[PDB]
Amino acid sequence: EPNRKWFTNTRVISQDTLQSFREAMAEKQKDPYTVLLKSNKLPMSLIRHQAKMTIEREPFSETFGPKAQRKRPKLSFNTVDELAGYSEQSLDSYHARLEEKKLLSVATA
Amino acid sequence: MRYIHSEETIPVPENVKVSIKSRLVTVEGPRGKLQKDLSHIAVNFSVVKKGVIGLEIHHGSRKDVAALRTVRTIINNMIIGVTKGFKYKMRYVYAHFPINVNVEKNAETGCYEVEIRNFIGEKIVRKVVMAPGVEVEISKAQKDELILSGNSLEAVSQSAADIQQICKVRNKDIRKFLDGIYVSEKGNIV
Amino acid sequence: TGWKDIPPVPTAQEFIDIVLSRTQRRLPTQIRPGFKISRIRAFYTRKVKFTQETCSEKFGAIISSFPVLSDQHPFHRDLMNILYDADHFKVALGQISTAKNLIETISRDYVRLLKYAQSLYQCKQLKRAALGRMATLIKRLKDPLIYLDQVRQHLARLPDINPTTRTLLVAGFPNVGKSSFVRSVTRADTPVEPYAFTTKSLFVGHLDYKYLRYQVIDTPGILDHPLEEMNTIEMQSVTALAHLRAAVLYFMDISEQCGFSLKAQINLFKSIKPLFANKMVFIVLNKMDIKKFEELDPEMQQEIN
Amino acid sequence: PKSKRARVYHLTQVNKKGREAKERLFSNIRETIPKYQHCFVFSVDNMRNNYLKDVRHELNDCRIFFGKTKLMARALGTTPEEEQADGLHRLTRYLTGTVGLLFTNRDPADIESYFSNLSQVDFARAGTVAPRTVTVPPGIVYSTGGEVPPEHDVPVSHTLEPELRRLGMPVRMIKGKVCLGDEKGEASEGYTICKEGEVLDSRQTRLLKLFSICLSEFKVSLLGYWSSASGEVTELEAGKTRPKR
Amino acid sequence: NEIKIIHLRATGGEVGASSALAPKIGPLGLSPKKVGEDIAKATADWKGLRVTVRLTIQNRQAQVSVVPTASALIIRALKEPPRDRKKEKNIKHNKSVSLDEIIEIARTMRFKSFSKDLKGGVKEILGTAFSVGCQVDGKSPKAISDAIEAGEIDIPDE
Amino acid sequence: ILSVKKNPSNPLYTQLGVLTKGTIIEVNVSDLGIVTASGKIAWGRYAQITNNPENDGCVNAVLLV
Amino acid sequence: AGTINKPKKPTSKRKTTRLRAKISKRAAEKKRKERKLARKNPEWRSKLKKDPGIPNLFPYKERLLQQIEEERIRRKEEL
Amino acid sequence: PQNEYIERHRKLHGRRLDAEERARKKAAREGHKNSENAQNLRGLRAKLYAKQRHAQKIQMRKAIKQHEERNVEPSDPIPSYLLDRAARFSVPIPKVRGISEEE
Amino acid sequence: KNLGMRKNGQVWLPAKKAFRPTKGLTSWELRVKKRQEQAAMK
Amino acid sequence: KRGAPGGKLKMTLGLPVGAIMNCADNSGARNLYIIAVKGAGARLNRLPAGGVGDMVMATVKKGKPELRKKVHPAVIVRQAKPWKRFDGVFLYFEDNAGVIVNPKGEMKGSAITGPVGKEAAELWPRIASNAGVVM
RNA sequence: UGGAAGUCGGAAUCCGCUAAGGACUGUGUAACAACUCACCUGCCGAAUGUACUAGCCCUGAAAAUGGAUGGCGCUCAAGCGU
Ligand SMILES: Nc1nc2c(ncn2[C@@H]2O[C@H](COP(=O)(O)OP(=O)(O)OP(=O)(O)O)[C@@H](O)[C@H]2O)c(=O)[nH]1
Numbered sequence A: 001e002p003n004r005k006w007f008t009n010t011r012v013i014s015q016d017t018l019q020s021f022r023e024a025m026a027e028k029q030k031d032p033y034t035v036l037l038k039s040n041k042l043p044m045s046l047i048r049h050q051a052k053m054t055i056e057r058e059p060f061s062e063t064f065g066p067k068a069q070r071k072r073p074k075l076s077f078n079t080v081d082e083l084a085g086y087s088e089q090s091l092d093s094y095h096a097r098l099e100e101k102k103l104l105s106v107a108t109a
Numbered sequence B: 001m002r003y004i005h006s007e008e009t010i011p012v013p014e015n016v017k018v019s020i021k022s023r024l025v026t027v028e029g030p031r032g033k034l035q036k037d038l039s040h041i042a043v044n045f046s047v048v049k050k051g052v053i054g055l056e057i058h059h060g061s062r063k064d065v066a067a068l069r070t071v072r073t074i075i076n077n078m079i080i081g082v083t084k085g086f087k088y089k090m091r092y093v094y095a096h097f098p099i100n101v102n103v104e105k106n107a108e109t110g111c112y113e114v115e116i117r118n119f120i121g122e123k124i125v126r127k128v129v130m131a132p133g134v135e136v137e138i139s140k141a142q143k144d145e146l147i148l149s150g151n152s153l154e155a156v157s158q159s160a161a162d163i164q165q166i167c168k169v170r171n172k173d174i175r176k177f178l179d180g181i182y183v184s185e186k187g188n189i190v
Numbered sequence C: 001t002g003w004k005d006i007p008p009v010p011t012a013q014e015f016i017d018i019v020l021s022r023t024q025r026r027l028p029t030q031i032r033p034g035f036k037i038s039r040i041r042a043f044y045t046r047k048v049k050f051t052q053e054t055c056s057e058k059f060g061a062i063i064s065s066f067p068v069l070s071d072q073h074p075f076h077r078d079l080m081n082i083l084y085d086a087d088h089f090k091v092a093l094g095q096i097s098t099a100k101n102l103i104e105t106i107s108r109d110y111v112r113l114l115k116y117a118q119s120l121y122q123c124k125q126l127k128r129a130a131l132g133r134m135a136t137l138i139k140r141l142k143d144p145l146i147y148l149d150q151v152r153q154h155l156a157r158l159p160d161i162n163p164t165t166r167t168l169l170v171a172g173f174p175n176v177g178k179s180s181f182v183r184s185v186t187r188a189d190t191p192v193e194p195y196a197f198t199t200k201s202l203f204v205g206h207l208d209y210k211y212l213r214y215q216v217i218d219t220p221g222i223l224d225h226p227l228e229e230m231n232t233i234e235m236q237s238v239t240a241l242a243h244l245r246a247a248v249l250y251f252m253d254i255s256e257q258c259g260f261s262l263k264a265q266i267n268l269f270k271s272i273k274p275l276f277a278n279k280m281v282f283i284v285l286n287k288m289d290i291k292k293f294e295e296l297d298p299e300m301q302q303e304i305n
Numbered sequence D: 001p002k003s004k005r006a007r008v009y010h011l012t013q014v015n016k017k018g019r020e021a022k023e024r025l026f027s028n029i030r031e032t033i034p035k036y037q038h039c040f041v042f043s044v045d046n047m048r049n050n051y052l053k054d055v056r057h058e059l060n061d062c063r064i065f066f067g068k069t070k071l072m073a074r075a076l077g078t079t080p081e082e083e084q085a086d087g088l089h090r091l092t093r094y095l096t097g098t099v100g101l102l103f104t105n106r107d108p109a110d111i112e113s114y115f116s117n118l119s120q121v122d123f124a125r126a127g128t129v130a131p132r133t134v135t136v137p138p139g140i141v142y143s144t145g146g147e148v149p150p151e152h153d154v155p156v157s158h159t160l161e162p163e164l165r166r167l168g169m170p171v172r173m174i175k176g177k178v179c180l181g182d183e184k185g186e187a188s189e190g191y192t193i194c195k196e197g198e199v200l201d202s203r204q205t206r207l208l209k210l211f212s213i214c215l216s217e218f219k220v221s222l223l224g225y226w227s228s229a230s231g232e233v234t235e236l237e238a239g240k241t242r243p244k245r
Numbered sequence E: 001n002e003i004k005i006i007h008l009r010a011t012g013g014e015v016g017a018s019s020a021l022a023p024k025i026g027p028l029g030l031s032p033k034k035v036g037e038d039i040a041k042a043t044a045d046w047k048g049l050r051v052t053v054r055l056t057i058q059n060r061q062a063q064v065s066v067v068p069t070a071s072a073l074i075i076r077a078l079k080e081p082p083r084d085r086k087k088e089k090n091i092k093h094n095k096s097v098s099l100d101e102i103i104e105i106a107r108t109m110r111f112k113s114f115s116k117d118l119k120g121g122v123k124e125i126l127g128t129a130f131s132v133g134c135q136v137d138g139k140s141p142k143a144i145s146d147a148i149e150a151g152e153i154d155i156p157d158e
Numbered sequence F: 001i002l003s004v005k006k007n008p009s010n011p012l013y014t015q016l017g018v019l020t021k022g023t024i025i026e027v028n029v030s031d032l033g034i035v036t037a038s039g040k041i042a043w044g045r046y047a048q049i050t051n052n053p054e055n056d057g058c059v060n061a062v063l064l065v
Numbered sequence G: 001a002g003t004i005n006k007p008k009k010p011t012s013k014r015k016t017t018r019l020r021a022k023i024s025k026r027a028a029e030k031k032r033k034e035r036k037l038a039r040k041n042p043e044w045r046s047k048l049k050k051d052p053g054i055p056n057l058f059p060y061k062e063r064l065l066q067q068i069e070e071e072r073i074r075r076k077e078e079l
Numbered sequence H: 001p002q003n004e005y006i007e008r009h010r011k012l013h014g015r016r017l018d019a020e021e022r023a024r025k026k027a028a029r030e031g032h033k034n035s036e037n038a039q040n041l042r043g044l045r046a047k048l049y050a051k052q053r054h055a056q057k058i059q060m061r062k063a064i065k066q067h068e069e070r071n072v073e074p075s076d077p078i079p080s081y082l083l084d085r086a087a088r089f090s091v092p093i094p095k096v097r098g099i100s101e102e103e
Numbered sequence I: 001k002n003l004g005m006r007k008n009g010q011v012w013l014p015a016k017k018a019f020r021p022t023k024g025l026t027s028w029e030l031r032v033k034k035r036q037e038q039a040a041m042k
Numbered sequence J: 001k002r003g004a005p006g007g008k009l010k011m012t013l014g015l016p017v018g019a020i021m022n023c024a025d026n027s028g029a030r031n032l033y034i035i036a037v038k039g040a041g042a043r044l045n046r047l048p049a050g051g052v053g054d055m056v057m058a059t060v061k062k063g064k065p066e067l068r069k070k071v072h073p074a075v076i077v078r079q080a081k082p083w084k085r086f087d088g089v090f091l092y093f094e095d096n097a098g099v100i101v102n103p104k105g106e107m108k109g110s111a112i113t114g115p116v117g118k119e120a121a122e123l124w125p126r127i128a129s130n131a132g133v134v135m
Numbered sequence K: 001u002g003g004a005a006g007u008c009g010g011a012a013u014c015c016g017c018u019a020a021g022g023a024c025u026g027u028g029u030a031a032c033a034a035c036u037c038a039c040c041u042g043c044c045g046a047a048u049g050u051a052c053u054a055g056c057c058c059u060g061a062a063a064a065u066g067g068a069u070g071g072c073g074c075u076c077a078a079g080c081g082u
């Protein structure tokens, strides 16, 4: 049956009350030996993109392919000296990781 | 719709003899004589003018009218075969293994035979038996070329297609392997 | 040892067609309303599980075959960073993995619902819902699939450079005879044409010296400008010079028929010499049928000294 | 009639002209008549007709029409009852085949002298007679096909080799070079494109155009001219020989 | 003694246009640095503009000449303030050029235009200016061309 | 979902909280920024289920604004 | 398809009595449901019907237009 | 091999001698093949083929329409701030099918 | 001889004519008169 | 290659799946337990079996402990089931024994104790090189 | 843009000579070149083109022993409409 109360807000709360409730409830979660009383009647519902940006700025078609317009690579170095340092530390990290994996006929099931 | 009368005309040169008997056309000229049985198509032949063959269909449909163009082109091709002849020049190219082509005349069957060897290094010997009337010659003017000559366009072109289709590269990239025999030129002997 | 073993990556529509084709043709398709409801549930559950298994197998085949940038040599990692946007590469493969995991979650949820479905119509609607959600998830991958197919073909055509072996590295300006040198000393088929930037990708050939196998790497030419202005074609050469412990042969044309000045070539050499630490540098002066060192000006000879 | 040829719709900017182009031609021809003293009829038969732009530029004070022959005849007026000016129906008898109109105010002697000494070497069309024998030598095929010495010729482009094979030359691709026979010019004879005193067909003329060999000439022949003052048509030399309708 | 004519596109006040020339002028016996200095001296009064340059080669020397192009003349007549190519890009030519300067450019291009009249040359220059994207007399060059057809704007004869 | 307000078929179905077509549910609309005239956050609002969840595997609803 | 050398199971055109009765019942119910939807349909229906007109290939279409002319002229004169 | 080696192979050696002729003849026979597919495919393959052909016909018709006119709203006038806007307090679905207790 | 080329390469093929089985059923001038009458009618 | 020797004449297969044979080399294993043979066909209820010179998959049950965690390819060199050669000789060895090799046939061990079969020596040249007695 | 000349991209897409020709439809070049399409002219000779509508026909989804317009069989019917 049509009724006016279908199109009204059913639960409302103010800014300061919501903030105080959240702060007090967070302080209650800080203690694991303190539990609520009548938790079923409490408003617990109130308590409880880099990839997208890169794809938006540069599409896959403009990156690589027959219609690609990409011409300038994205680098982590600026001049030749930091390029040499980057290569040196990259080789050192690669060798260290390989030694770590080495330290860490098929096998039986 | 059934068209009451439809007609086609074939001009005949002076050196051609055409004999039609129960839709069996026999065309004889300077180079030779050909025969073809066209009894599977309902058509009436007549002599409309001197040196002119008339083909007519009565009370036929559009398909029956359109078949006269095929009959006209077939008889014209027979006339062109007995007057000027037909010649297909084919070229066989290779990348690494030289393709060896031998031509001989099997006299017992009265027909030419072509043997193809070393096609991409294969040890098998491919053999193509010509239709009778088709003569095979290894061309001396150009390099790696066969010449197929005859009076029957169907026989010469079918022999050429057999030579193309017996040399096919299998299980390889056709962009990379371009070996084979291909029909380079089609034309008349005279 | 090459990346030719990557299976071909279809488009979104081709992927949907393939998965639904195996689902249609590799499973029985006749079920009757007069059968037992457990039998109907088993039928549609098998359909959903088979579709998920096909999708997961294909997605795992795509992910497990593409190279992992963190586990490559720094030369290969930075070379793939030059050729392909490494961010875009990782985003595409992460979206593939995300779609795989979401397809698995959708399949598990709809199998759980098919456990409680009570009629053949409800089971059919649940199966169609699961398959439509999987098709929508695949359709949201139109661009990464095309990108990964192009990357796969380029990786399959990429040469094999061993980062730690006896290796010569030819570098310099365009039109100085690098490709002619590599053709003369190796069996590699690198084009030699008078225009600049004829070589657009790294070529590698091989030779033998004292019964030892050497690899020789021909690189695209490098121009004289700061590193921020360098495009990908020259940055392939810059990556090869930076990350490969090689014998660098810097080729110079003193005749200046390459279109560049000797001062510019010397300036580029002095700019890239920090990368030449712990590497063996040989300046090879080419084209002496045109002009020679003694025919050069004394100040240029002094600067080269 | 289900079995029919699929009529291809063209996704290009330029459309069919139609009747409006004919009406525009009628208006232009019927408006250039009362401004020029003489109207010449010229003929260019079996010619490429691409130097008419240079002729139009050189004769800036003249007006040249090269539309449809029947359209130009009906524009000038075929019968004396419909002619725009007196004597134009006499001029319309020369408009057959590939002809054109030249409205001018210059001296007819000057026009005849200009179209006499005007001559540019041009590619031959099908139906012309070959003035000489042209043969591409065996070996590496060059751009001119042996017209210039081979030491001063660039090799022919590799993309033209399928076109030469389709046009009948048995060339082949060796090491990126289009070669006739072998690389060193052996095991084959030269390819004779045309023989002297032989009617050229489209295949031979296209081969000569690809090899940049010109075996014809561009001659504009004046048939006659109508004068506004005298109201009469004076017939020139080529007009007697050329058929009239 | 043979005379060879080579047409090229170059930026004025630049040397690197001869980088592409040295593949072909090198076999001809020319000095690429000398050719670059010559084209820089010839195009010193076309700074920052793409300008067609003709090189005439005979007896192993080349003389440089500037072949005018309508787009370059319109861009120069726009009087765009001096700038460097490498730092800022994607620029637009949206300044104004006067109709008198357009007619002067057409008079410069009477040797290239095949039009019967200076009005036809002026309209060609207006079409080129419309392609460039500038404005003439504060209005659209297409609008001025349509006004020239309509007849209220009169182009002087020759 | 905060509560099931009315299942139109049977009050027992509402007591059991059954989500079918035409069911009024109460949803937390805190993520939509619906605010009262003075600044109070409207965090509970009715909505109607407009699909068949037992055949679709999901609950689709329309706000009663 | 390898149908000539190895035909598959034939499709029977011999109708089943149960199938025919069910199809007849379903057809009657479809006719009834279409009647109900036609009665409850809110889609607009023009009272006037669009005239198909006179074919162009009729050779006396001119003449028909003439007696239409003096028919309407005589009607206007009489009115 | 390395890089665009098939393209380099085509540059140095060309393609097959009948490749252009075979491609042209295949493009010519495409109409016959399409009609044979429309009149001879069976079952689900035929249904998918028919649906895809309907899709291409719709797309081609729209493309032809767009090339044809390359060269060429509520009732009551309301201002810009009243656009895209729309008693009885009824729900969107006031009546649904009742569910029996066996269901 | 034939001064042109054929695309398929069948140089022996004759200069075919248009397949018009309804040829000769009417004349050109009569068709022009009918065209004028249909234009006035429309 | 799936370790299937070519050119092997048919003989009696005396070692089915589940058999335990001696480990004849010095790789450190004392016995081998057969879990599959290479080149076995598909047949209902039939246990795969192998003879002398056949490559099998085996697990180490007695021996050095780091051999007990993997599945090794092995070649059977001796069997106790009598088999016939092409010269009409029916023969059998004192015990069932094999050697651990790689998938390519190269031996992991360095020497062989006791004789090896003619068929094994024929189909595996490394066993013929590391064998002392060939029977 | 390293190179981009109608034909890797973004935005515009005008004028002249016109009989007609898009700041271009594809092939092609590193870029050019070259070929081709749209459009026009010459030869020819009289009817065509587009989209719909109504009939019959093909497809428009099928499992599992060997079979069914009732069966043979029927093709200007022994099928379909009057
Ligand atoms: N006279 C002479 N000309 C040379 C010599 N070496 C190379 N050239 C010419 O210089 C041009 C340089 O072409 P490449 O050999 O490809 O040099 P490059 O373009 O820098 O090499 P890439 O960057 O790998 O493409 C060639 O076309 C040769 O014609 C030489 O030693 N003497």
Ligand SMILES: [Mg+2]
Residues within 6 Å of the ligand: C174, C175, C192, C193, C194, C195, C196, C197, C198, C199
């Ligand atoms: Mg180069």
